[PDB]
Amino acid sequence: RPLSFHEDRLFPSDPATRSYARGLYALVKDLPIISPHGHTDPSWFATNAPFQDATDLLLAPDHYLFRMLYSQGVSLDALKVRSKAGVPDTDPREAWRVFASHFYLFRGTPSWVWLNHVFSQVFGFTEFLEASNADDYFDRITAALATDAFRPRALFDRFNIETLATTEGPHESLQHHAAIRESGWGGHVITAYRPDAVIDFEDERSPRAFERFAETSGQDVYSWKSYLEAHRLRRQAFIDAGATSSDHGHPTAATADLSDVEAEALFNSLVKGDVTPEKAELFRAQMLTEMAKMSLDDGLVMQIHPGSHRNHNVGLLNSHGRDKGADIPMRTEYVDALKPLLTRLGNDPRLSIILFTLDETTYSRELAPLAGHYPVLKLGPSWWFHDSPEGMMRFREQVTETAGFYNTVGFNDDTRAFLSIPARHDVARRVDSAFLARMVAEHRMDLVEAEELIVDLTYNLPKKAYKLDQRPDWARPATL
Amino acid sequence: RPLSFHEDRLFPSDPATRSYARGLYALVKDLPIISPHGHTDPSWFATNAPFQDATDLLLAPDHYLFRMLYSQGVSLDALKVRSKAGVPDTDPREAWRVFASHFYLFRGTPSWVWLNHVFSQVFGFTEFLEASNADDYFDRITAALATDAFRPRALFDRFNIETLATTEGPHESLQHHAAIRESGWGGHVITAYRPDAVIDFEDERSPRAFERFAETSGQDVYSWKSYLEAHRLRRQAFIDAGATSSDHGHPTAATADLSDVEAEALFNSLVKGDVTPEKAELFRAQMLTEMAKMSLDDGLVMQIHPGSHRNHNVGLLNSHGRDKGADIPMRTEYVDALKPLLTRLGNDPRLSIILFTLDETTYSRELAPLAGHYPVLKLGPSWWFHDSPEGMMRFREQVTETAGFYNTVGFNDDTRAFLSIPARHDVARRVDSAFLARMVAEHRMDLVEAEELIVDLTYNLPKKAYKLDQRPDWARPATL
Amino acid sequence: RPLSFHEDRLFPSDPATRSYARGLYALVKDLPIISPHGHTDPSWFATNAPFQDATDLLLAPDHYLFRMLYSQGVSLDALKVRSKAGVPDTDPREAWRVFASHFYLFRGTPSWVWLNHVFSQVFGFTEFLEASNADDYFDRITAALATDAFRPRALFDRFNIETLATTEGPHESLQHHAAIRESGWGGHVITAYRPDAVIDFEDERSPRAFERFAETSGQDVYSWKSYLEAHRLRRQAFIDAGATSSDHGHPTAATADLSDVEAEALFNSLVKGDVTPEKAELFRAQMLTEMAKMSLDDGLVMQIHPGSHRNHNVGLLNSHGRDKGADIPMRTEYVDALKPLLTRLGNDPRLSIILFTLDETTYSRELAPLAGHYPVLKLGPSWWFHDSPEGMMRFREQVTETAGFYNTVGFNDDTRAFLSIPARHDVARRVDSAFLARMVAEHRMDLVEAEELIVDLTYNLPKKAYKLDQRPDWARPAT
Ligand SMILES: [K+]
Ligand SMILES: [K+]
Ligand SMILES: [K+]
């Protein structure tokens, strides 16, 4: 069976609308990729070591894929998924065989589009992945990964990535990032500040996180005023690594505006070990405001990623640990939650906040009204389960009416799967084009406006929001 | 004015999409109906007595219809709706006359589609229902009901129903199901286990339910371990009557994982008469887990139907009683709610749970993320008010990207109106055809995949999910 | 760059569906405007004084426009927005300049459609608004407002408005309405009862509104039984001014059924000064039921507009005050909330309630199942942030299947911007035509049904629902 990957995919069937869409996408398809939020390993580009298997690249590290298979009765051992006891005994060929046999599950899901984009456009496959085709797929991409063109830096250059952001905590060292810039390569690989491990006292890996947060900053992190200094010192070390943004994956969008003493008192109680869910929530809430207060000084762009019920499968958390596809969205609140921070700093020009959600109902109700008013608020793209074609379309249909396009930030891939990056960004460009085309076709915007918009949405608006206009000296110049 | 019931109804207007839709539907339109959850009376097929009126068959027992009329100033006595004081004194012809004169209300509703299917396909009417057409409709339906071709069993065969499930509690007899099997007629009419009345202590008809639950089981029902034995024995009796499923219509999706002594303690308090809203919730929650623990042994597929505010009209509950169209959906939660059961049994191979909702906002947020991960969880079709062209489409648009298609169970009609069964299944088939057609037209799926999926969704997937693959000897063999 | 305002705007691109839409809209485009809920100033038509600037008419009063600009970093002083310290020192021409340079922000928003309608249809502009175009736009509409064709009364007649309802509290005078109905101009301008200031005790302007509520009624407003009489007497004065409606903008849709004695107990505590959030909520809850009980006698139609977290920007409330575009929607509940009122009066033929929402998730879940059952309940059109093409389409797509079309109430504009009224009503007619066309094209309704429906939805249904069938003798006959 052939792999048919149509040049006009994701555009609406209506030929009038499809013709407008294709023209808008034409203006935008070969523009460089700006990836200002993501979870790729910077040690891939630091060492420039090859990837080994198809499984180690596409199957084992991607939770979107092994979720579905786990959901249908397949063990994580059968797919070589990294356990807490280490990498399983399974043959990487046999792990791939199981995936290929279960590839039908992904029909109508965005993984069908992303992987077939990788298969047809990166590897040049001409047949569709099945059980009969499985081994041919395995050894042909294993062989491709051994070649010099499929080295991490070479792929970065081939994919036309202008900016790539990894996410690191304050307790981990930025040694791999230093290696990117002191090598002459010039690929603009940046970091972002995720202090979640030293902010969430209910995190099980928080005691060890605090311990190496002390090493990296050289401060008394168990006393409040030097805990804050430690954040300031580490933030500056991130800005020195090029970072322009901070990221905050809290369970809630809650913020608080405690006095310096009220915060210290709370900090003392939690460090003492008297950790209640109420105190831990309030500290996370106070830290959002505290991080924003530092952003007034150091100029970091603040991303809030709330609403994930992390580690919902308890039995899986014991056996395999974090990020194994069992993080489930919760209903999130913003109007009452963000009010304390917005009372203090909501009209401040020096602050920039980008809001994400796992709860689509808040789009037209809360997010678009808030962001269409507050100078500091901006709207991030549809995230996680919603970075799909239908989720992206719902975003545009529900957000634009009140917020407009200029109160959004564009798109990020938000992935560990490196090869899927051009695939994911392509999908975004086509869906934006489809939305914009429909506005032209229904005479809700002029074509001249639409042609200005995709270039803005794709390229200019991400760059302004993430303060990416100032390229460093160690990076390549920005060219079209 | 003519009854124009078009061949291309429910397909999108876009001609390229419409023609894919038409092609997929043709592959599926004449497949047998599998109806694994519903509320038809089993006595209809055991006695094979004819229906009497157009009013008694279409108007009086259907709450979808009299709701709208009651909503517009019509009394239920005017429409011959069974009161708590019995069947009203009004003329069935006059009841039909009022409905006919108010049939315009249903413009744009799915009942327009279902009833016009019944009028044009089942009865062969050629004119549209109006006030001046009313009497002609009444006596032509009534005359038709006297014929041998409109006997319940004869209609079951004409409709090409393969499997029909009814819904009984543990306190009622499986009298009519035994009579169906024992007869020469080979219709596969089965049952479903719905223990709601002996589980909800806040149910007003619970003390009488518990009383006859003791008669049907022969057990000490007001003592814990033998209340559980009474459930096991009754479930076995349902299995022997052909049941493959259980059904749970609780106010919430809440589950619990109490110890044996904690469960007995709570049970004893409620049996004593200390029914507090908190304790009644906890028992309904604990019983969800308890039914799943029984399902580990007997293989009953567990359907959860939560989130209905039953009997919202208090005045109507006093005068007429239950199921009179005053049950309003509530905001429903699944993530925290289902966690205690999923921690215990979420990764078990032997357990099969099907989740339904009245809260469409949980599709992309909670249900699909949960069902796209857990081995035990599957998604039921859009239910009740969302069992409709716009509703089924929203389900498919919001659920597919995370759960896929193979984590869904197809379609159930969930109706008492027997004549609307082929009408409702036809709507399911056209909307599914329309959705798949849009995937093909926008090149998000290959035609080959869509042709496979339409047949699976219609026939194979409802069969697998409801364990309908073993026909019993007392029914017909399954042919296309 | 030309101002191209296409004659088939807002209809779907699909040529067959579009052709149906165009035919349904043709049946309805020139019908008179029924505006059963709005916030226009009755003194405009009473005095018939002209409007001054482009800024004072279009930019400064409309919060949809200055929301977007403030959101991008523009000060409200730079846009001549009324502060608490009065009208700013800035030039109206220079305020217009800022808006014109930032008109690109409104791409994809309903403000694009409304304003270009005003620009092309009301004014006759031929070029698109830009920074280089700013000054020409300003003084050409400044000069047009001086002319006799653009006087409030002349525009009312030109726009073919049949009915206009304004919104007044019980503590203010209906002098301007009295001036309307005694002059020879036959424009049907009515009012609507909005008792929010004398019911919400957490309102900062409540103690002052209680004082003038006593003045206009001549009752002991600070004791329960005469407080209720003060409402009844003021409600009669509104009906004298032609009002058919009351409006209730509470934070919650909560209702209550307290006894006469529990209600007085609660009232007495709040008048004492013991205002707690729980007591204030319960009073707002009880007062909804009380207004409903009054509606059984005087026949007023009850509009519930819940869910707005008003004055979310604290610093802006202190500096500029109310209605400055910082009123954010909250999640709203209707099922448990409306139950105490519906247990008492849910089946009563004399009662009419119209339900609004700011929370689109309640449409298919709560609002349509409630309205598709209870004899008293009806659904108002998509409100505020949702009175827009995608919002109205989501409304129709989520409400119709359970509630039907006859449990809805048509459209209202809900606006201060008087020139935007025909624009907003046109959008409503185009989207309704679009939705009905899609039903016909998918053969879910017949064309005969759709042809009846847009005329009902546009004209007949709003009139029946707001009891606008009996024209008073001071107003022009409807034609
Ligand atoms: K599953
Ligand atoms: K109604
Ligand atoms: K903003």
From Swiss-Prot, chain C:
The pathway it acts in is:
Carbohydrate metabolism; pentose and glucuronate interconversion
One annotated GO biological process: D-galacturonate catabolic process
InterPro entries for this protein? Metal_Hydrolase (IPR032466), Uronate_isomerase (IPR003766)
This protein's source sits in the domain of life called: Bacteria
Signal peptide start-end:
none
Cited Pfam families: UxaC
The reactions it catalyses are: D-glucuronate = D-fructuronate; aldehydo-D-galacturonate = keto-D-tagaturonate
GO MF, one term, reads: glucuronate isomerase activity
EC number assigned by the record: 5.3.1.12
Name of protein: Uronate isomerase
Name its species: Caulobacter vibrioides (strain ATCC 19089 / CIP 103742 / CB 15)
